[PDB]
Amino acid sequence: YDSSSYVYYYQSAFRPPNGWHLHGGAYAVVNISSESNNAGSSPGCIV
Amino acid sequence: YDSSSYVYYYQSAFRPPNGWHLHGGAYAVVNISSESNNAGSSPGCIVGTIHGGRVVNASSIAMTAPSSGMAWSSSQFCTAHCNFSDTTVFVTHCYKYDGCPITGMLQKNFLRVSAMKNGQLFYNLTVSVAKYPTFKSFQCVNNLTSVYLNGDLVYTSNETTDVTSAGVYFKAGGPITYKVMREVKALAYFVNGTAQDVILCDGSPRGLLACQYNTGNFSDGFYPFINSSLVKQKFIVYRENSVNTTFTLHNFTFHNETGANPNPSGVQNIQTYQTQTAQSGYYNFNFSFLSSFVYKESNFMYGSYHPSCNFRLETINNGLWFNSLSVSIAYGPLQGGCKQSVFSGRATCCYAYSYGGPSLCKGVYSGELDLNFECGLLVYVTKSGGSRIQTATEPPVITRHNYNNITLNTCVDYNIYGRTGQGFITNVTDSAVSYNYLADAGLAILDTSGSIDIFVVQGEYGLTYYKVNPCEDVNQQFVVSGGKLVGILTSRNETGSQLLENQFYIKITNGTRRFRRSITENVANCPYVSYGKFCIKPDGSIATIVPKQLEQFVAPLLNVTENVLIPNSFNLTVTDEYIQTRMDKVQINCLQYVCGNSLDCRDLFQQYGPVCDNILSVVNSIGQKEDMELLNFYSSTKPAGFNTPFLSNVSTGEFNISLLLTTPSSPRRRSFIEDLLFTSVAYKNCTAGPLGFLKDLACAREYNGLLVLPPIITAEMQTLYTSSLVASMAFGGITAAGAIPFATQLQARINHLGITQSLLLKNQEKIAASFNKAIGRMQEGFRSTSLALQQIQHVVNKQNAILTETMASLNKNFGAISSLIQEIYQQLDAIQANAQVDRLITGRLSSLSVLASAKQAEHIRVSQQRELATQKINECVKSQSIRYSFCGNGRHVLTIPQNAPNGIVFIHFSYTPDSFVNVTAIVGFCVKPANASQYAIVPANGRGIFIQVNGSYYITARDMYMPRAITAGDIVTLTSCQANYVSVNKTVITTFV
Ligand SMILES: *[C@@H]1O[C@H](CO)[C@@H](O[C@@H]2O[C@H](CO)[C@@H](O[C@@H]3O[C@H](CO)[C@@H](O)[C@H](O)[C@H]3NC(C)=O)[C@H](O)[C@H]2NC(C)=O)[C@H](O)[C@H]1NC(C)=O
Ligand SMILES: *[C@@H]1O[C@H](CO)[C@@H](O[C@@H]2O[C@H](CO)[C@@H](O[C@@H]3O[C@H](CO)[C@@H](O)[C@H](O)[C@H]3NC(C)=O)[C@H](O)[C@H]2NC(C)=O)[C@H](O)[C@H]1NC(C)=O
Ligand SMILES: *[C@@H]1O[C@H](CO)[C@@H](O[C@@H]2O[C@H](CO)[C@@H](O)[C@H](O)[C@H]2NC(C)=O)[C@H](O)[C@H]1NC(C)=O
Ligand SMILES: *[C@@H]1O[C@H](CO)[C@@H](O[C@@H]2O[C@H](CO)[C@@H](O)[C@H](O)[C@H]2NC(C)=O)[C@H](O)[C@H]1NC(C)=O
Ligand SMILES: *[C@@H]1O[C@H](CO)[C@@H](O[C@@H]2O[C@H](CO)[C@@H](O)[C@H](O)[C@H]2NC(C)=O)[C@H](O)[C@H]1NC(C)=O
Ligand SMILES: *[C@@H]1O[C@H](CO)[C@@H](O[C@@H]2O[C@H](CO)[C@@H](O)[C@H](O)[C@H]2NC(C)=O)[C@H](O)[C@H]1NC(C)=O
Ligand SMILES: *[C@@H]1O[C@H](CO)[C@@H](O[C@@H]2O[C@H](CO)[C@@H](O)[C@H](O)[C@H]2NC(C)=O)[C@H](O)[C@H]1NC(C)=O
Ligand SMILES: *[C@@H]1O[C@H](CO)[C@@H](O)[C@H](O)[C@H]1NC(C)=O
Ligand SMILES: *[C@@H]1O[C@H](CO)[C@@H](O)[C@H](O)[C@H]1NC(C)=O
Ligand SMILES: *[C@@H]1O[C@H](CO)[C@@H](O)[C@H](O)[C@H]1NC(C)=O
Ligand SMILES: *[C@@H]1O[C@H](CO)[C@@H](O)[C@H](O)[C@H]1NC(C)=O
Numbered sequence A: 001y002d003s004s005s006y007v008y009y010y011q012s013a014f015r016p017p018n019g020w021h022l023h024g025g026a027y028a029v030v031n032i033s034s035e036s037n038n039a040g041s042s043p044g045c046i047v
Numbered sequence B: 001y002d003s004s005s006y007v008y009y010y011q012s013a014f015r016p017p018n019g020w021h022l023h024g025g026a027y028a029v030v031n032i033s034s035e036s037n038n039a040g041s042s043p044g045c046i047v048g049t050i051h052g053g054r055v056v057n058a059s060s061i062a063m064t065a066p067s068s069g070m071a072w073s074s075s076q077f078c079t080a081h082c083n084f085s086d087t088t089v090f091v092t093h094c095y096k097y098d099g100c101p102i103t104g105m106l107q108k109n110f111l112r113v114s115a116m117k118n119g120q121l122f123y124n125l126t127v128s129v130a131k132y133p134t135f136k137s138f139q140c141v142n143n144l145t146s147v148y149l150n151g152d153l154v155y156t157s158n159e160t161t162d163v164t165s166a167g168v169y170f171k172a173g174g175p176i177t178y179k180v181m182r183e184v185k186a187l188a189y190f191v192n193g194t195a196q197d198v199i200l201c202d203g204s205p206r207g208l209l210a211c212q213y214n215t216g217n218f219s220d221g222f223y224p225f226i227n228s229s230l231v232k233q234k235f236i237v238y239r240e241n242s243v244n245t246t247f248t249l250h251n252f253t254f255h256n257e258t259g260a261n262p263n264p265s266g267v268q269n270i271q272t273y274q275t276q277t278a279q280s281g282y283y284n285f286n287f288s289f290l291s292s293f294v295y296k297e298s299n300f301m302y303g304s305y306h307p308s309c310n311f312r313l314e315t316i317n318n319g320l321w322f323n324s325l326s327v328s329i330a331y332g333p334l335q336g337g338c339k340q341s342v343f344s345g346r347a348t349c350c351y352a353y354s355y356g357g358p359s360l361c362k363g364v365y366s367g368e369l370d371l372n373f374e375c376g377l378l379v380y381v382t383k384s385g386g387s388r389i390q391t392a393t394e395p396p397v398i399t400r401h402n403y404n405n406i407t408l409n410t411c412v413d414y415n416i417y418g419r420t421g422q423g424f425i426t427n428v429t430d431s432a433v434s435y436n437y438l439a440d441a442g443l444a445i446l447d448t449s450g451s452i453d454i455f456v457v458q459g460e461y462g463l464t465y466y467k468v469n470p471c472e473d474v475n476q477q478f479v480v481s482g483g484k485l486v487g488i489l490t491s492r493n494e495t496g497s498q499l500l501e502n503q504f505y506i507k508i509t510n511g512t513r514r515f516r517r518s519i520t521e522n523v524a525n526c527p528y529v530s531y532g533k534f535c536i537k538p539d540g541s542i543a544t545i546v547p548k549q550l551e552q553f554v555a556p557l558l559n560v561t562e563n564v565l566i567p568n569s570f571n572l573t574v575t576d577e578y579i580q581t582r583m584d585k586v587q588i589n590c591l592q593y594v595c596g597n598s599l600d601c602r603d604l605f606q607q608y609g610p611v612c613d614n615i616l617s618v619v620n621s622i623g624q625k626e627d628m629e630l631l632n633f634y635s636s637t638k639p640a641g642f643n644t645p646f647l648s649n650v651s652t653g654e655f656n657i658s659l660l661l662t663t664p665s666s667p668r669r670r671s672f673i674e675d676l677l678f679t680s681v682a683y684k685n686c687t688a689g690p691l692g693f694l695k696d697l698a699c700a701r702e703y704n705g706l707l708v709l710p711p712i713i714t715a716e717m718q719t720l721y722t723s724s725l726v727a728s729m730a731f732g733g734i735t736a737a738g739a740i741p742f743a744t745q746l747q748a749r750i751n752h753l754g755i756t757q758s759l760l761l762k763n764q765e766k767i768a769a770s771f772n773k774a775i776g777r778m779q780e781g782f783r784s785t786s787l788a789l790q791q792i793q794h795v796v797n798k799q800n801a802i803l804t805e806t807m808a809s810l811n812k813n814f815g816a817i818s819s820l821i822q823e824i825y826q827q828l829d830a831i832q833a834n835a836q837v838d839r840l841i842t843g844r845l846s847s848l849s850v851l852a853s854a855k856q857a858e859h860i861r862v863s864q865q866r867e868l869a870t871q872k873i874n875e876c877v878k879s880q881s882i883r884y885s886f887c888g889n890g891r892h893v894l895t896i897p898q899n900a901p902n903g904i905v906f907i908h909f910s911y912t913p914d915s916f917v918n919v920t921a922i923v924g925f926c927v928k929p930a931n932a933s934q935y936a937i938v939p940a941n942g943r944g945i946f947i948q949v950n951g952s953y954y955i956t957a958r959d960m961y962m963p964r965a966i967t968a969g970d971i972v973t974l975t976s977c978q979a980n981y982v983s984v985n986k987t988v989i990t991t992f993v
């Protein structure tokens, strides 16, 4: 559910059983953008 | 109803019709006690004396007599009173001596049921000795303080007072019985409006069936049931927080404060004069706003807007599940508070309470903001449906206890995540720590119908996964067979002395303790109750089933020379079957079935026009389509007339067939075997005169509008059909000279298996002995183990059970307030009753739709079996074709049809011999002639392989050992032989001079 066309979003901690089921929420995509390696000269990001 | 285990008690002077019906009242027994002959030295008990009590402080009492013995005369019966704490009730047949002002010494007089307080008398009613023939029983019931001379009411009053004493005077008679009781539920079968027996709900195995399925005189087969009983270790799993928590619910309070001014013109200018929010865990909401604040019901503009939040504000504190929650109070206007403050506002839904407020309030709406309105307080609630926070009232009792000790594999109560169930819990986390069996949001999995299938728990070294399956008695069955209960087919093992296929079996104790375990016996066929290679008798013990099969032979298929087995003697093995061929046509009168005999209900019905046309057209169509080709079926097979009785004193040779055909001395034209068929199972005057127990349901049908129509073949036109058909089977052929009514047909039909016609003085008494043994097995076979009888049973029971549920669908009310329609308009309003009447009429027309669809499906069934019936009449009766085992498990000889309940019953006669001979066989010849030629001889088709006997050579048929010299027309000349022959040097044609 982590593809390049939608983002999943679990509807509140219970699960209905094996089968298709409908919801409504912010699931689409617009303006996908990438980013990588946001670190400085340190060997690890400080907490 | 006056047994030693219950006391009857008629429910208020009306009687529902013939059938089982349920009630609830004081019917049980506890502490039965006897007493007899409460008289002194006097020859008879004097009337009017109230003494002779017996102190019983119980919640009931009952004085019962033996079965209709105590008359009302002298020296037999006297007062027999109860008493309450202050008031009494006493019966008195005060016939005259000097004492009371009645002045009558005879029967045909009255009684005195009269109450009495401390000093005075009131409520004299004088019921006759008619309608109360004999003193049977006398009760005094706690609740409603009512007293019951046998059966119905005689006196009620206001109070709720328990019985303190009772007592009966009488000189002699039956020993009377005192008994107190409790209150249970029971149901009573009663015909003609008077009780025969009851069934109690006392936890007995016979009782639970009647108490759950609302019936007795049950059908045979299987029935599931329950008995809920559980006081064991319950365990609760609350919703775990992060770490290191004691689950303490927060308390959010509210109070009306000294509020500010009402709002100006803007709908954003109303200010919430409180705010609260829900974050995690548990909460409750102390609403002290029921004090003199009315609730305003929602309508077109004002009031609440509770759609999208089905709960009402005083029901939050029960177990709910939200995802985010925030409530707040605000003092705005009333006509447009919620209908504007939900759409353009800040809440999902809001409520509107009111009080006595000053009418200077500037309302909020587009264009109508220049008036002055009321100011009731309106609460907001911002619901988002989900599962993060749970609202509950009582504090959770798990106080510093991480979930280490909960029980497994035991039938417990569970209350996990606010959903109460009853089952046991296994450990399934070995298969669930892999397969990512739940995602990163770890809580339970709902199945369908809102239960829990797999939940989680946290607090150990690693999180586990538990599964919830129901207890051992979620589906128990108990087998009934024929007429009574046999035993419980359960899933548990309570020292169950028998194991069936994938289920354990016990057996209830009937009288003596023995007859529990035995060695199973092998049954050929059983029609009683069958369950997976095991058959259950009405005796109670099981017996395993194993089907038999008979031998067959096609034996001559001959390569290189070797002796073969062909039969010399032969037997006949009977076989029956039943095929339905007729149908009772119906005619639904919808207007008289829906409404009763009323002046109204019809003007309301006359806008239900086309649905009666739709329910009438399919019944009319199936009636016509049956009634045409029924006459086609009658005109295709009724042979020639032959209106001759042939009543089985006709002298046959040695065939005792008079068992099978009709008798001279009978009121109906009926033989013996279909009389045995009839004893296992249209001219009336319905205004007066009954006929029988079952045929007189036609007057109950015609008074509700489900009437029948006669067939196109009339009555006493089908009873000559079977006789004419066997008359054409017998007499067809001969010219009636020479003692051949039935024999010659059979001998000239039996030699078609071989190849001859009508041979005499050989094969004449062998057929007689074989057919006599066959009819002996036939007359043995019908009463115990046959094939036609259970088919007759199932067809008759289904044809009765189609119509007897659309008559008992009248008292079954739909979504309504009652069943009858006469007293709907008398109890409530006019323009509110029409919804109730529309629901009831729509339900009854749905029931007629079910009836018409079932009738059409049954017509398709009977048309299928009718075309198979005309095919089998055209082939198996008058033709004797050579189709192997079409009718009667072998190459058939002859059939005889007989009558049945709305069908015909065949009797097939097979041909299965067993005794064989050992004779040598050869496959061909190749004779060489004298000068120069060469040919072979192969036996032709339809004349059988040929054999040799002690030097000579003979051909024979493939079924009957019948040696005969080879002729010239049974040969095949071929210019080849390949040493798989005999090669006689001389010719073996045996031609003639
Ligand atoms: C629940 O709370 C309500 C709001 O706090 C109370 O209603 C208030 O009652 C007051 C007394 O009648 C009103 O004060 C008066 O308002 C009028 C305007 O309509 C002014 O002219 C008066 O001068 C003023 N009286 C003063 C200042 O002494 C409030 O306006 C009114 N609030 C409203 C309607 O929103 C309820 O009484 C209270 N219920 C209880 C405690 O049971
Ligand atoms: C349902 O099945 C689960 C899976 O077996 C059980 O969970 C197991 O409990 C064991 C005892 O509490 C744990 O064993 C311990 O593991 C740690 C680390 O591996 C060791 O240091 C301990 O010595 C060891 N304890 C011993 C050997 O006694 C298992 O790790 C644990 N398995 C898991 C969490 O996957 C559940 O206990 C069981 N349910 C019930 C009610 O018993
Ligand atoms: C049962 O009811 C009878 C009828 O009232 C009671 O009999 C009366 O008892 C009082 C005192 O016990 C007497 O003064 C009356 O004379 C009695 N009535 C008659 C007609 O003689 C009787 O007491 C009640 N039983 C109990 C246990 O209280
Ligand atoms: C029930 O019947 C009795 C008959 O005994 C009525 O008793 C009479 O009551 C009146 C008024 O109290 C007396 O004047 C009579 O003398 C009584 N008759 C007697 C003693 O024989 C009693 O009133 C009736 N109850 C009613 C009418 O409610
Ligand atoms: C319905 O069940 C009752 C049982 O209460 C049956 O009534 C019994 O019928 C037999 C048949 O001869 C009698 O011997 C009993 O005396 C009857 N018992 C009572 C209490 O009347 C009744 O026959 C059943 N009806 C059916 C099967 O149609
Ligand atoms: C209810 O009423 C019917 C109608 O009379 C009774 O049926 C009769 O039963 C007797 C058996 O003793 C038969 O001889 C009659 O022929 C029946 N009448 C018919 C068929 O019209 C039935 O027995 C009554 N039920 C009772 C008395 O419990
Ligand atoms: C066909 O006709 C023959 C000749 O009449 C019948 O043979 C007779 O059978 C009876 C019964 O066994 C004997 O008692 C007679 O002696 C026989 N007659 C003879 C030998 O001449 C034969 O039964 C007839 N077939 C039928 C009636 O089916
Ligand atoms: C859209 O994406 C571009 C780069 O792909 C980025 O610079 C820009 O800020 C994005 N706009 C948004 C997220 O509104
Ligand atoms: C129970 O029956 C006994 C029988 O002797 C009797 O003495 C007793 O009073 C009864 N108890 C009641 C009716 O409460
Ligand atoms: C009811 O009768 C019983 C009989 O023994 C007695 O024990 C009890 O005290 C009575 N209760 C009363 C008079 O309230
Ligand atoms: C019968 O009496 C009991 C006594 O507690 C009462 O609860 C019940 O409601 C009564 N049944 C009625 C009035 O139908």
Ligand SMILES: *[C@@H]1O[C@H](CO)[C@@H](O)[C@H](O)[C@H]1NC(C)=O
Binding pocket: B158, B159
């Ligand atoms: C029951 O009704 C009677 C009838 O007059 C009355 O006297 C009695 O007070 C009533 N009981 C009440 C009201 O508790």
Ligand SMILES: *[C@@H]1O[C@H](CO)[C@@H](O)[C@H](O)[C@H]1NC(C)=O
Binding pocket: B203, B205, B226, B227, B228, B229, B488
């Ligand atoms: C149902 O449960 C009750 C309660 O103990 C029991 O008495 C009864 O025999 C059970 N019914 C069965 C086992 O058919």
Ligand SMILES: *[C@@H]1O[C@H](CO)[C@@H](O)[C@H](O)[C@H]1NC(C)=O
Binding pocket: B248, B249, B250, B251, B395
């Ligand atoms: C208020 O909350 C405390 C815990 O914070 C709880 O112990 C107490 O019972 C609550 N008061 C109620 C429910 O009246």
Ligand SMILES: *[C@@H]1O[C@H](CO)[C@@H](O)[C@H](O)[C@H]1NC(C)=O
Binding pocket: B253, B286, B288
């Ligand atoms: C709500 O609060 C009031 C304030 O005094 C209190 O009396 C009442 O008991 C509370 N109701 C609850 C805790 O259910």
Ligand SMILES: *[C@@H]1O[C@H](CO)[C@@H](O)[C@H](O)[C@H]1NC(C)=O
Binding pocket: B493, B495, B496
């Ligand atoms: C049922 O219980 C009996 C004990 O009487 C036992 O012999 C039998 O093996 C059990 N059935 C099983 C375990 O399937």
Ligand SMILES: *[C@@H]1O[C@H](CO)[C@@H](O)[C@H](O)[C@H]1NC(C)=O
Binding pocket: B569, B570, B571, B770, B773, B914, B915
């Ligand atoms: C078959 O026929 C022979 C002689 O007719 C007889 O002995 C044998 O019992 C028969 N077998 C049956 C009827 O099964």
Ligand SMILES: *[C@@H]1O[C@H](CO)[C@@H](O)[C@H](O)[C@H]1NC(C)=O
Binding pocket: B647, B649, B664
């Ligand atoms: C056979 O029964 C019929 C019936 O009436 C009778 O006419 C005939 O004479 C009977 N045959 C006899 C007695 O041989």
Ligand SMILES: *[C@@H]1O[C@H](CO)[C@@H](O)[C@H](O)[C@H]1NC(C)=O
Binding pocket: B656, B658, B659
């Ligand atoms: C045919 O069998 C029946 C059965 O009992 C018998 O009564 C009758 O006499 C027999 N007829 C004969 C042998 O002709």
Ligand SMILES: *[C@@H]1O[C@H](CO)[C@@H](O)[C@H](O)[C@H]1NC(C)=O
Binding pocket: B685, B687, B688, B689
């Ligand atoms: C048949 O019913 C009619 C209906 O009016 C009646 O007149 C007639 O007497 C009845 N016949 C009887 C009861 O034999």
Ligand SMILES: *[C@@H]1O[C@H](CO)[C@@H](O)[C@H](O)[C@H]1NC(C)=O
Binding pocket: B563, B565, B918
């Ligand atoms: C026929 O007889 C021969 C010799 O007696 C034997 O070998 C053969 O098995 C027999 N056929 C049978 C018994 O079918």
